[PDB]
Design a binder for this molecule. Structure first.
Ligand SMILES: COCC(COC)n1c(-c2cc(C)c(=O)n(C)c2)nc2cc(N3CCOCC3)ccc21
Length: 113
């Protein structure tokens, strides 16, 4: 019942929700690492120094890599920030990031004390 454990449970619930069918219509571009070569995005790794995606957040949670909620939240926000950095703000993927980040921020704010 440690505070860090309990907050990490809330983080894991958020993570499960972001990966759930409820949000699938807009969450899917964040499921796997951006495959820059496959998508023809040959500048992606010159612009984004620290790629992040929900499969990587899941592997790090399963590995007990995150020591607290703050470390978890940093990777999820790195994923969104990467999207806002690389993409013109009017691109479909940006609208999808905005929507999924709204899901994230509102539930992250319900963190237990
Ligand atoms: C809505 O996203 C559109 C972009 C298009 O990039 C060229 N996109 C990204 C993508 C995502 C992010 C976060 C980003 O910043 N960029 C630039 C592209 N990842 C993708 C993966 C796929 N597929 C098709 C379905 O099976 C899986 C592979 C298809 C499109 C994708």
């Amino acid at each position: 019942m440690g505070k860090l454990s309990e907050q990490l449970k809330h983080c894991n619930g958020i993570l499960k929700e972001l990966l759930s069918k409820k949000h699938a219509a807009y969450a899917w571009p964040f499921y796997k690492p951006v495959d820059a070569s496959a998508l023809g995005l040959h500048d992606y790794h010159d612009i984004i120094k620290h790629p992040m995606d929900l499969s990587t957040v899941k592997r790090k949670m399963e590995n007990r890599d995150y020591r607290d909620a703050q470390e978890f939240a940093a990777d999820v926000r790195l994923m969104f920030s990467n999207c806002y950095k690389y993409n013109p703000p009017d691109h479909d993927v940006v609208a999808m990031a905005r929507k999924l980040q709204d899901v994230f921020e509102f539930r992250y704010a319900k963190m237990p004390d």
